[PDB]
């Protein structure tokens, strides 16, 4: 599939794809966290 941007772009992208990968993945991870302790708290607020 080809794209219309510049390679100049794309070569210098292709760095920055992994630490943005690597960000998505730990971004991802902590809002799975925040939504266990969320329905942790909402489990508790419910029996309450």
């Given amino acids: 599939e080809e ?3 510049p390679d100049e772009v794309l070569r ?3 760095d ?3 630490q943005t990968i ?3 993945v ?3 991870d902590h809002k ?3 939504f266990h302790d969320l329905q942790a ?3 508790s607020a419910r029996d309450q």
Avoid: G, H, S, V
């Fill in 3 to 5: 794209l219309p941007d």
């Fill in 12 to 14: 210098n992208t292709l």
């Fill in 16 to 18: 920055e794809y992994e």
């Fill in 22 to 24: 690597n960000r998505i």
């Fill in 26 to 28: 730990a971004d991802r």
């Fill in 32 to 34: 799975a966290a925040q």
């Fill in 41 to 43: 708290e909402l489990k």
